[PDB]
């Protein structure tokens, strides 16, 4: 297999379906990536993640650098060996979680220093150090290090952070390219910034394409703006990116967000919703989400979802899972999470098949009618 | 298969190895039963419990009657269907946990009333009601309802509780026999009482054998007395029980307790140690227990145990499991528990094979030399 090859097999409107070939495996697109926080997709063995249909998972650099540590993971053979997942892994840059989770942060044109939220130890991230940590982990897809822009942002602040992000994108590119083993075996994605402002999004797209990346994320969304605004920004933002590379919407999201984002040209997604919502008692079904803690499920012998092909829905009832979650049982988290990840993978499969068959627009309409009935 | 058939295939001293045939499966003895508290062996799917080698699991009647409720489980098809374990299940009577976990208890010759530790709701147990709840759950091996005797107990109190327990054993026998479906498809075990007093243990054994049961537990041990005293009581207590029926030591225990109890004629065991200790970070190995949280394992690439055949030791390192447990990750509880239950099943298999080959005494000596080195 090549280091990186993205091939589009079929299109319908702005939607695409195809494959990314990498050394550790093939990724079918549109793709959903389960989130593997600190070297575990919570409550699942990696074989179970694979069994649900996932081709690639995400790792959180911020969490991994704090515990167990990036150099330690490298000493132990890399993230794949450590956690037992041998297929591709995408790592974020760590910068977003520094902003949202750490303390005592000091930002500058060079990078950021911050205090761990676990024990107050001091740490640093920069374009160079982020790329280096992602190398130490052995990541297959490396995200450039950028500067997040809060929602809402003024035009001036959005421009300043977008401009810095583009300078940091060049530094990330150069750091990645200077490390032979990383440049030859991994891929590097850049992140478009610019908030809700069309002209900034265009400048950002132009700058990233001039540098050149293996894929392009739409950054700065899913941070408080609401679905209407997110879709409006995607409407004009995704067409600015190179058509022949993957388009990644970071941190999205709900099933209906994913469908609408594919309709607007997105190829890749990640979200903690199926895992985190699952542990809290929310199960996704084709008839919308349900809260399994609700007393109406206490004697319900049906599976979580009537059509789902996952092993949980083959074997256990709503009534049983209701009991487990109410009781705080680990198996409740395990079963809810496996079903939710499998549901998300079945959604991506139906999206891929409907695009290949030229009936995705109808699928999206039917999906929404039933999901929101 | 018959309702119940115990066959001894080989003997060495007081130790025996053989099989219990029941309608839902064969149990190899000496047997270890993982504990399935409130309809889950914590952090394991039932298929994983089976994969480690378990032939039978235990259910806690006290917990099940509080949550999700005995009548509810019956409405839903019984415990086996509810939790997805189709092999034999042994249920305790609930009486011990009333004593140790509930509040506001009022005891009498008829039974006990008590307040739930979860929500203060009032409940009742008696010989008749305990047998009935165990029927509602669909238990394959039913424990008679007895009265626990704290350690230490005076001769007078030990005698009074043993005498009541024997009256309650007759009431349990009669309740079980009056329910056609239960009498024809399940088995009933009686519990010897009498504390550390040889004459009381003899009176208890004689009374239970006159009533007649499918198996006999040695009750009142593993409650604070220490291994020397426990072994001393087993020395004279087990020979008093009918030789041709299974001998069950409830709530035991550590690997070395199990080996010594088999040397004294015990055929069946249950304990929360492998599951509960596992979640807390203790792993059992042939070289003794280890605390995986200890900093010395942070970069240890070896498996938990160098010989263990379990899937955890095939696939993940001490270093990884150390990280998971330190981080509070659900997968840490999952992997530690699977290894510990598998270790216990491998111990029982080595015990069974060595008895069949007439070399159990040597195995016990070798086991202890290495386990305590
Ligand atoms: Cl999560
Ligand atoms: Cl437990
Ligand atoms: Zn399912
Ligand atoms: Zn093992």
Curated annotation (Swiss-Prot), chains A, B:
One of its GO terms (biological process) is queuosine biosynthetic process. Pathway: tRNA modification; tRNA-queuosine biosynthesis. It is an enzyme of class 2 (transferase). One of its GO terms (cellular component) is cytosol. Gene3D superfamilies: Queuine tRNA-ribosyltransferase-like. Its EC number is 2.4.2.29. Residues 251-257, 275-279 are annotated as: RNA binding. Its cofactor is Zn(2+). Binds 1 zinc ion per subunit. The keyword Zinc applies. Changing residue 93 to A: Strongly reduces activity. Coiled coil: none annotated. Homodimer. Within each dimer, one monomer is responsible for RNA recognition and catalysis, while the other monomer binds to the replacement base PreQ1. Belongs to the queuine tRNA-ribosyltransferase family. This is Queuine tRNA-ribosyltransferase. It comes from Zymomonas mobilis subsp. mobilis (strain ATCC 31821 / ZM4 / CP4).
């Amino acid at each position: 297999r090549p280091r990186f090859s993205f091939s589009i097999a079929a299109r319908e409107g702005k939607a695409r379906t195809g494959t990314i070939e990498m050394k550790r495996g093939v990724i079918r697109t549109p793709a959903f990536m389960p989130v593997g926080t600190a070297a575990t997709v919570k409550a699942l063995k990696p074989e179970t993640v694979r069994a649900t249909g996932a081709d690639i998972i995400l790792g959180n650099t911020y969490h991994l650098m704090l515990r167990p540590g990036a150099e330690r993971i490298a000493k132990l053979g890399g993230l794949h060996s450590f956690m037992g997942w041998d297929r591709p892994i995408l790592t974020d840059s760590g910068g977003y979680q520094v902003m949202s989770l750490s303390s005592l942060t000091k930002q500058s044109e060079e990078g950021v220093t911050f205090k761990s939220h676990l024990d107050g130890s001091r740490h640093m991230l920069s374009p160079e150090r982020s790329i280096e940590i992602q190398h130490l982990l052995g990541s297959d897809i490396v995200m450039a290090f950028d500067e997040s822009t809060p929602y809402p942002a003024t035009p001036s602040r959005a421009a300043s952070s977008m401009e810095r992000s583009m300078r940091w994108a060049k530094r990330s590119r150069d750091a990645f390219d200077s490390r032979k083993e990383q440049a030859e075996n991994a891929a590097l994605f850049g992140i478009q910034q610019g908030s809700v402002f069309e002209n900034l999004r265009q400048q950002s797209a132009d700058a990233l394409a001039e540098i050149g990346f293996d894929g392009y994320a739409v950054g700065g969304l899913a941070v408080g703006e609401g679905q209407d605004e997110m879709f409006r920004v995607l409407d004009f933002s995704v067409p600015m990116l190179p058509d022949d590379k993957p388009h990644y919407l970071m941190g999205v999201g709900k099933p209906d967000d994913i469908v609408g984002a594919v309709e607007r040209g997105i190829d890749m997604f990640d979200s903690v919703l199926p895992t985190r919502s699952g542990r809290n008692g929310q199960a996704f079904t084709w008839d919308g989400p349900i809260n399994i803690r609700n007393a109406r499920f206490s004697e319900d012998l049906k599976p979580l979802d009537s059509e789902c092909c996952c092993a949980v829905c083959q074997k256990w009832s709503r009534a049983y899972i209701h009991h487990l979650i109410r009781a705080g049982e680990i198996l409740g988290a395990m079963l809810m999470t496996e079903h939710n990840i499998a549901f998300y993978q079945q959604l991506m499969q139906k999206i891929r098949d409907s695009i290949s068959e030229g009936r995705f627009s109808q699928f999206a309409q039917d999906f929404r009618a039933r999901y929101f009935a």
